[PDB]
Amino acid sequence: ARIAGINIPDHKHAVIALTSIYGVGKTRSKAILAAAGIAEDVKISELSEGQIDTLRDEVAKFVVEGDLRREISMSIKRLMDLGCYRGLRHRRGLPVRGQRTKTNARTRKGPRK
Amino acid sequence: AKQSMKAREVKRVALADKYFAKRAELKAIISDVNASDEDRWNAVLKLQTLPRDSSPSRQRNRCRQTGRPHGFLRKFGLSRIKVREAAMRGEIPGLKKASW
Amino acid sequence: NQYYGTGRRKSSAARVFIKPGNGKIVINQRSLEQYFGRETARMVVRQPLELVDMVEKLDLYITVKGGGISGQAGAIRHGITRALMEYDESLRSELRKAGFVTRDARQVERKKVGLRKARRRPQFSKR
Amino acid sequence: RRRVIGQRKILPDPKFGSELLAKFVNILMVDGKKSTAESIVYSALETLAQRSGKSELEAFEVALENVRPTVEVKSRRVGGSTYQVPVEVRPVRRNALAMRWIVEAARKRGDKSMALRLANELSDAAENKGTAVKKREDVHRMAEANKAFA
Amino acid sequence: RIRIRLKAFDHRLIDQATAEIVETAKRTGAQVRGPIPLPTRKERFTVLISPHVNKDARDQYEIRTHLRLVDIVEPTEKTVDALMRLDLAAGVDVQISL
């Protein structure tokens, strides 16, 4: 449960579903257990917490959750005030990486008319 | 070739002597803005921005029969078509087609 | 007697010597009795010499320069087929059956009055 | 309207002496590199040992005889007229087409290395249960639409 | 030691210039009999056939640049004057060095 998200898998072991939950892959959550010293023993049908807290900084390189979903959106704190046009483009369906706004836009704005 | 761009090309040579010679040693010491973070020579810092047109920016060598930036050979100053005229007159030294 | 040949392939060049009587199999001062025994071109030069059979009653020397091992094989093989057709006239007949009586040059030709990269024709009209 | 050939010189295999076993490499190769195809030929014969491999002292020259292209349709006229009739592919082309038919099936198996994929498809062609044939089934129907010709 | 620089855009004119300075050297005492030709260079140039909107179609022109230095072990009272007064030939650049 928890570690890289807010999810509690029902009646399964502690390491389950620590994968695909954004910012974490499918394979490192199993391929790093030996480096972390984790065993898959003492299996119970109910929640536990604060036993594998060390795993958080092995499944992710820098950040999870958190953190991650707003640190990957940090630029708005310095763009969304007064007549800033990169801010206005971000409030709208428009790109801000330097890319042109009239072309290659139907993913961010929506389908063609 | 534009007479105002020809006259500017002459003014540039006479200003490279003025704003681009014997100023580089001063420019190396006045351009630092972190080593003390203190402001004490602002008039001399704004002197490095005095030249606007006489520095290696804007300056292009160009085709010397049209003023054009395009389609020329700087080893002769001639265009990729006036080189055919001058080679057909022997007027570019040793440059030939066959006859060897 | 002494028999000799030259061979050339895309900036690789070889000279070959062949003599009757016991000897060695040598390339650029190294013996093929232990050298080149893993390299990806070691057999593609030996088939013309299987017309006379090596070492026991034959001596070989190869000297080569330039090109990768695949290109050196073509150059060395032409040096061998020239030296071997000059070794005996009944071997010329067996090399002729294998087509080894021609020099392969196949140069890249020159570009004429435009047409982009050498000759590659661009895309078509509206149409 | 003028050529007339010119068959061009080709280098037969150095160890098996065969032109057909060198011809296979020209179709097995990718991006003109050829060297990896030269590492897959005969390496696919040690894997084929455990299976239905035909004449091992002939490598693939007899196993290619279990792959059966025979006819070609479309892009044709007869008697000056448009006709949907089949023609029989030239014997010097039939095996070079069979080479593409087997390497294009073998590389598109979803498992193991090419040396194993090709040994499976050559064993399964020797019992006519092979993969990648539905892509040419509508052509085989068009070849069976006519037996009376012109 | 001194060197006499001869530069030309043709492989026959550099040998005519070599024969002209050897003919003059034999006529000022002795100073040059058969100098070394050095390595060669080429420069290739393209020109356009139509003055506008076709730059794909070009024609090719060439210069073959030669260099000779002559090299002298001991100059004379005639090397420093009579060989310097030489007018040589048209199409060739002559310089004294060092």
Added chain:
RNA sequence: CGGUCCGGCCGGGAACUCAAAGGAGACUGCCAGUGAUAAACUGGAGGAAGGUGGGGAUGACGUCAAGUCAUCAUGGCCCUUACGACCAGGGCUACACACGUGCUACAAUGGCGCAUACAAAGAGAAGCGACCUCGCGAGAGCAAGCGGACCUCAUAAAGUGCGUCGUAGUCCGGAUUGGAGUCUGCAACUCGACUCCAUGAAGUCGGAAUCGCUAGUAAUCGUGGAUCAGAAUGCCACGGUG
């Protein structure tokens, strides 16, 4: 051929490459066919190559109210206390609607860390910039040698062979995302380049219609040259495999 730090190295040599150039070879000659047995063509033998040997470089008559007031010339007409040159702002990426041409992955014939083999074209004095240290790196300190075949740019990559993950929308693949470094410049607001990361949507060769090439051709992976205050995968060349 002589000596051998056992090496083209050194003696010494013009053999073989080779650099700057000049010749020879091929005559349908020879066999056998084709055909007003003519004119004119086609197989075979030999040869490195043969039937204008091939490929360039050579642009008749011309086609059409041919293109261009934007290379340049210049009438008619206009602006001339300016629509002129000069400055500082901006506009040809504002986004309500949108498109050629061209390229990259779709694998294990891979992705990654090592071992390992072979280049041409060229290019440089307010130039290329070394040796050696520092900077995760872009770069910086610094200033030999060479006027450019005993100096500088510059260890080309695809390819060859181990180890390792594995058919998992993929341990392959690429849009996002957030900041800091290096170089230059009025200026890095904004559509600078070079440099180091984390997140990983899409992608299983793609509907209709449709392009290139007869052989060192088509295909394919890298490296130079030119532009350049700072700015490419484009423009033009060249080599490896084929």
